[PDB]
């Protein structure tokens, strides 16, 4: 029994490698040779929003792109107004430990969860001028690492027990569970169409999941260590990942194989976030050296460096308009660059 | 600015005033962290995530223990770690040593001091006085070690020494370990109190430029 299974798996893996190595006729860096480069860009910090008394672990821009959430380890969530640097709301959490945060696309709800395995949902626009809990979604086994809002009634969550789930908020129980990962799931990214989503774990492999059917579609493996962040090209046909090998990579969907790798000899620290620009040319990245870099996504040549913090950077976010970029840090201060 | 903007600025000021008070009240307590594998009795030292809370001489302590490389970055501002190990099993002592070595040489805990607690010394006494199981079977170097019934003292000194040896191999002098031989013992809070006081004292000496 076992012998046939092992032999069949090995034969299929070899078959898959042989098939995907028949398409790569030309690399990317050989096609975009005659392209005018970007040059040098310089961004000066335009604002700094202070008021937290501990480290910052999460952040998310509003659909309007004028407001934002931020969750700290002191047990409090603050909603800021970027233009006037004013605090619209202050929310105190039941559990001090928190590792994620999200802002609903309409603007009526926020959500958060952490080292207690529960994802709690808060409602913003009510009578009485209060901010009170609506639901407490439970049923996971390990901590939660990331959660993204789908509608005003659906969520997708990634836990630390090697599984992802799709919740319907009103009833309170899961409707779909995605399995097949062998390590903790650290990052989750949605698609602009909201019909597929990609996930990244600690066994150095990312996967492409379907939402309605509920079954894995493709698996990509090109890294040497665990993965800590993931994004999606604005077109919806490519995504960039970042790991503990101090290197980034750009995988493709239709061609099925990796395209390019971004790495420098001087940098050896792991990455903690990643993001694109509105057009898709720049690629931001945040390291543990207390600074961020900017990569030209079609040439792999550095273009600029932002260094306004003292401790490592936890989250990086870009607005829908693309007017500004906000980066969080452990020095309790998150700035806004333009 | 119009009238609405001044009213919104007033609201922001009040929010901030509340945040400051909450911060100071939070700043008046001392937090810890508890670690122990199994068959060690972590819950019987002071007799998703559980937590306790105690006090001694008008100081407030908080404990945290879950039921591990990835969530350990959250606890890098606590004052001290607690590590509870068993002392009657000879089969798994190597596993406890490897676990201690992995915690001591981590990357985010490079300045957090450890407290040890070697449990169940009376079971060690009975198991070594019976003579059925010998330490020389599992540890070869025990035959030559001589102490600096005398048998119980020799054995327990050997077991304590190997942990302290793991501790002093490469620490750089920024943090240290504080062994203990805990039995039904009822004075487990005074010891933690004294060791935390000493930890903060070394910190204050380091800040005032004397060292």
């Amino acid at each position, epitope marked *: 029994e076992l012998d046939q299974l092992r032999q069949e798996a090995e034969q299929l893996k070899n078959q898959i490698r042989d098939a995907r190595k028949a398409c790569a006729d030309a690399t990317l860096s050989q096609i975009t040779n005659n392209i005018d480069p970007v040059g040098r860009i310089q961004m000066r910090t335009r604002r700094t929003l202070r008021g937290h008394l501990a480290k910052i672990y999460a952040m998310h821009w509003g659909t309007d792109s004028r407001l934002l959430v931020s969750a700290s380890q002191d047990g409090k969530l603050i909603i800021w107004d970027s233009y006037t640097t*004013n605090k*619209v709301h202050a929310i105190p959490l039941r559990s001090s430990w928190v590792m994620t945060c999200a802002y609903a696309p309409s603007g009526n709800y926020v959500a958060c969860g952490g080292l207690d395995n529960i994802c709690s949902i808060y409602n913003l626009k009510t009578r*009485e*001028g209060n901010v009170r809990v609506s639901r407490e979604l439970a049923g996971h086994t390990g901590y939660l690492s990331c959660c993204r809002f789908l509608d005003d009634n659906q969520i997708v969550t990634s836990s630390g027990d090697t599984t992802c789930a799709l919740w319907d908020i009103e009833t309170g129980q899961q409707t779909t569970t995605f399995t097949g990962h062998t390590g903790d799931v650290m990052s989750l990214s949605l698609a602009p169409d909201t019909r597929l989503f990609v996930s990244g774990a600690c066994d150095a492999s990312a996967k492409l999941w379907d939402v309605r059917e509920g079954m894995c579609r493709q698996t990509f493996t090109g890294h040497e260590s665990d993965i800590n962040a993931i994004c999606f090209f604005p077109n919806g046909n490519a995504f960039a990942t970042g790991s503990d090998d101090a290197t980034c990579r750009l995988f493709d969907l239709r061609a099925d194989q990796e395209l390019m790798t971004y790495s420098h000899d001087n940098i050896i620290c792991g990455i903690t976030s990643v993001s694109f620009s509105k057009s898709g040319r720049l690629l931001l990245a945040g390291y543990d050296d207390f600074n961020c870099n900017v990569w030209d996504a079609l040439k792999a040549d550095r273009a600029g460096v932002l260094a306004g913090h003292d401790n490592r950077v936890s989250c990086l976010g870009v607005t829908d308009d693309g007017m500004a970029v906000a980066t969080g840090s452990w020095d309790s201060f998150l700035k806004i660059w333009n | 600015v*119009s*009238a*609405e903007d001044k*009213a*919104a600025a*007033e609201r922001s000021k009040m929010i901030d005033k509340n945040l400051r008070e909450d911060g100071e009240k939070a700043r008046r307590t001392l937090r810890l962290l508890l670690l122990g594998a199994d068959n060690s009795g972590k819950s019987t030292i002071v007799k998703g995530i559980f937590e306790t809370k105690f006090q001694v001489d008008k100081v407030n302590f908080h404990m945290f223990d879950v039921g591990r490389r990835k969530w350990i970055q959250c606890f890098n501002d606590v004052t001290a770690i607690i590590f509870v190990v068993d002392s009657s099993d000879y089969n798994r002592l190597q596993e406890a040593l490897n676990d201690f070595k992995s915690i001591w040489n981590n990357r985010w805990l490079r300045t957090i001091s450890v407290i040890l607690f070697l449990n169940k010394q009376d079971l060690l006494a009975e198991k070594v006085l019976a003579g059925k199981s010998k330490i020389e079977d599992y540890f070869p170097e025990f035959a030559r070690y001589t102490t600096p019934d005398p048998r119980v003292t020799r054995a327990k000194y050997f077991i304590r020494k190997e942990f302290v040896d793991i501790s002093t191999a490469s620490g750089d002098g920024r943090h240290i370990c504080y062994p203990h031989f805990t039995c039904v013992d009822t004075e487990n809070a005074r010891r933690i109190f004294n060791d935390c006081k000493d930890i903060i004292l070394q910190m204050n000496l380091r800040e005032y430029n004397l060292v």
Partner: single-chain antibody
Amino acid sequence: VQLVESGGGLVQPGGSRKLSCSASGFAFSSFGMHWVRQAPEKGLEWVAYISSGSGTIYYADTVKGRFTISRDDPKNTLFLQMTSLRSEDTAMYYCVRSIYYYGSSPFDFWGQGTTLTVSSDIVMTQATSSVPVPGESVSISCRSSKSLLHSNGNTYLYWFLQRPGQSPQLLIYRMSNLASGVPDRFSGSGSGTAFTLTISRLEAEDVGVYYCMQHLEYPLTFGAGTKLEL
């Protein structure tokens, strides 16, 4: 939410009276109270405003120096103290609550009024007083003394509709947005110094008086008002 006002009655001239309002079902501390009085043959006129936490106090020129406003957070009550009364103070006083933050809507709830009978400025005027009109669209226009459009791009104009023998309710805030619990048929359009309110598919119980109020700067001044009849 419930707002209740206790006080009023016949008072001799030069007498001192106290009006107490108690609010329940919402957080009193966050909101900032307002005082509005309506004359028997005249439109609503602003009287006094108290900021949340008692940080800022503003008074009308007419009642300045003889009226004191105070509030107690624990008792959840609002008090107005009047001294040295005159003959032209016979009116009805309504308790109003407003909260200020980005995207918030002020003057959402109006408390029940009481009766008290004794024994420069932006000028906003509406040309139409009475309009005769179901199933036919109606248009109401309110003129302004000066442009209400600020540097930020926000124009402050408020439309209030009062049914016969009932407290007025907010319909449109900032001349575009629609208040919660209000039907979609009502619409608001505007330009600097000219504002028009258009209602379509008019039905029964929509008859009432409409007032345009500018919140650009203190003191707030209400419009003359327009009366709708079948």
